[PDB]
Each structure stands twice: as C-alpha cells, then as structure tokens.
C-alpha cells in the first residue's frame, strides 16, 4: 500500500541512513510493496532463523537429532546468552539450542549450532543450495553484528531474505513437521516486544525474529496475518543511523502499524 511506502521513506529521513522494506504474499510469493529490495543489509540475529532452517534440514535427512546433547565450556559463552549460560553442566539439545537462538536470540546457542554444520560458509552453502545466491554469513557471534559500512559480509537483501524465509516456511525443502517446528519457535519469540508485535492487534498471528547491530543496525523478519493465521511475509532492515535503539524501535512499530492499517 502506497501509504506504508510513504511511511518507510519517512522512517528513513527521520532516522537517517538506509531503510529496507518488502512485503510478500505467503501463498503466491508476490511482492506487494518494497523499498531498497535488492540492496545489502547486515542480517544480524535474523540469520538464526536460517541457521535452524539448515539444522532442521539435516534432521529431516536423518543426519541430525534434535534431542542430541551438546556440551560446552565457559569459553564458548559470548555476549548475550540468557539460556546457554544456565546449562554449562547440563549441556543442551540441538532442539533447546534452536529454541534459545530464535526465542531468545541466544548468541552462544547460535555458535554451537553453527559448529554442528561446519560454520558460516556451510550455512551459506545451504543458502546457495536452496536457490539463495545472495545471502551470506561469514562470521560468528558477536562479530557478525558489526555492520561496517560497505561490508558485504554477513549481509542480505530484503527480497533475498523474504523469499528465503518463504521457501523455508512453505516450500518442499523442509518436511511438514520441521516447517511447523520452525514457525513454532518464531511464534514463541520473546525478545521482539517493541517492534511489529507492539502494533499487532489481538487476533493476529505473528511468527518473527528480530536483530540488533552496531552503527544503529536493526532488523526484523516476520510471518504475520489476521484471523490467527499468517498470510504475508514482512522484512525490515536498517543501518547507518545514529538514532537510538528506541527511535529505531518506534519507527519499526510504526511501519508495522501502517501495514496493518492498509491491509
Ligand atoms: Ca531517503
């Protein structure tokens, strides 16, 4: 809707820097609206939905096991690890690790999962394998949220991310069981309050994952819809701004309020 596009362009002037936007029909895959659709933005924690996508994929192939118990040391714990910092002696399962990464953006969990598959380039090779020759993860947490200007490392484009998420959520890549699991994790997202969720009305469904970076980087990928079912995929990204994480949060919630108003 033209109005939401006007509000995205307004968000950019307000925040400074760059804002990327795309709205996609879940069933058709049709692009409804867009802004800087083919430009690169640092992925940030949003990549974790792609990681667990890769992981579930190996489970589906009988190569991985969600119940498999992984162990780690205190040197594995990097910044921000609400869950993993609790289970140093326990260990955690691939499942619980994926649950931590998506529902809590646990950075250490994400690192552990990355190891199970061989790291950044392996995740990228997964992306490349499924038709996404644009998205790329190069580093680990937390260096990947660095978002240096004009650095194509750990970046994606709105359209690239949006269509990849769609393939993961609805395609024939992942079994039904795994497609359900991945969206269950995203619906159980607990660290994305002041974004799309804060504009979402009662009755509406939302499965999402947010991200925060340096240099005012901020992002979110979501599957949302009314009537308790998802029907569109929304992807928002921003970086290069000096505005605080609130003025950024507020601009995302507003973009959200607008996509809902002109549904
Ligand atoms: Ca502008």
UniProtKB/Swiss-Prot annotation:
Changing residue 139 to S: In TEM-5, TEM-8 and TEM-24. InterPro entries: Beta-lactam/transpept-like (IPR012338), Beta-lactam_cat (IPR045155), Beta-lactam_class-A (IPR000871), Beta-lactam_class-A_AS (IPR023650). The active site is at residues 45, 143. GO terms for molecular function: beta-lactamase activity. Keywords: Antibiotic resistance, Disulfide bond, Hydrolase, Plasmid, Signal, Transposable element. Its EC number is 3.5.2.6. It catalyses: a beta-lactam + H2O = a substituted beta-amino acid. PROSITE patterns: BETA_LACTAMASE_A. One of its GO terms (biological process) is beta-lactam antibiotic catabolic process. Changing residue 14 to K: In TEM-2, TEM-3, TEM-8, TEM-16 and TEM-24. The keyword Lipid metabolism does not apply. It is an enzyme of class 3 (hydrolase). Disulfide bonds join 52-98. Substrate binds at residues 209-211. This protein is used as a marker in many commonly used cloning vectors, such as pBR322 and the pUC series. TEM-type are the most prevalent beta-lactamases in enterobacteria; they hydrolyze the beta-lactam bond in susceptible beta-lactam antibiotics, thus conferring resistance to penicillins and cephalosporins. TEM-3 and TEM-4 are capable of hydrolyzing cefotaxime and ceftazidime. TEM-5 is capable of hydrolyzing ceftazidime. TEM-6 is capable of hydrolyzing ceftazidime and aztreonam. TEM-8/CAZ-2, TEM-16/CAZ-7 and TEM-24/CAZ-6 are markedly active against ceftazidime. IRT-4 shows resistance to beta-lactamase inhibitors. The beta-lactamase present on pBR322 was cloned from plasmid R1 (R7268). Belongs to the class-A beta-lactamase family. This is Beta-lactamase TEM. It comes from Escherichia coli.
């Amino acid at each position: 809707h033209p109005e939401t596009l006007v509000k995205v362009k307004d968000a950019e002037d307000q925040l400074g820097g760059r804002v990327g936007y795309i709205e996609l029909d879940l069933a058709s895959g049709k692009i409804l609206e867009s802004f800087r659709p083919e430009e690169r933005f640092p992925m940030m924690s949003t990549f974790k939905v792609l990681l667990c996508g890769a992981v579930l994929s190996r489970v589906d192939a009988g190569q991985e096991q969600l119940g498999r118990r992984i162990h780690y040391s205190q040197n594995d714990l990097v910044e921000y690890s609400p869950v993993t910092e609790k289970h140093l002696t326990d260990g955690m399962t691939v499942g619980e690790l994926c649950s931590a990464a998506i529902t809590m953006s646990d950075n250490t969990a994400a690192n552990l999962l990355l190891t199970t598959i061989g790291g950044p380039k392996e995740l990228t090779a997964f992306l490349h394998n499924m038709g996404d020759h644009v998205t790329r993860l190069d580093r680990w947490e937390p260096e990947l949220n660095e978002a240096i200007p004009n650095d194509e490392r750990d970046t994606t484009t709105p359209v690239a991310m949006a269509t990849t998420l769609r393939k993961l959520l609805t395609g024939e890549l992942l079994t039904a069981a795994s497609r359900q699991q991945l969206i269950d994790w995203m619906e159980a997202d607990k660290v994305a309050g002041p974004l799309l969720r804060s504009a979402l009305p009662a009755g509406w469904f939302i499965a999402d994952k947010s991200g925060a970076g340096e240099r005012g980087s901020r992002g979110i990928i979501a599957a949302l819809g009314p009537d308790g079912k998802p029907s569109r995929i929304v992807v928002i990204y921003m970086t290069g701004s000096q505005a605080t994480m609130d003025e950024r949060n507020r601009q995302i919630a507003e973009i959200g309020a607008s996509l809902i108003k002109h549904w």
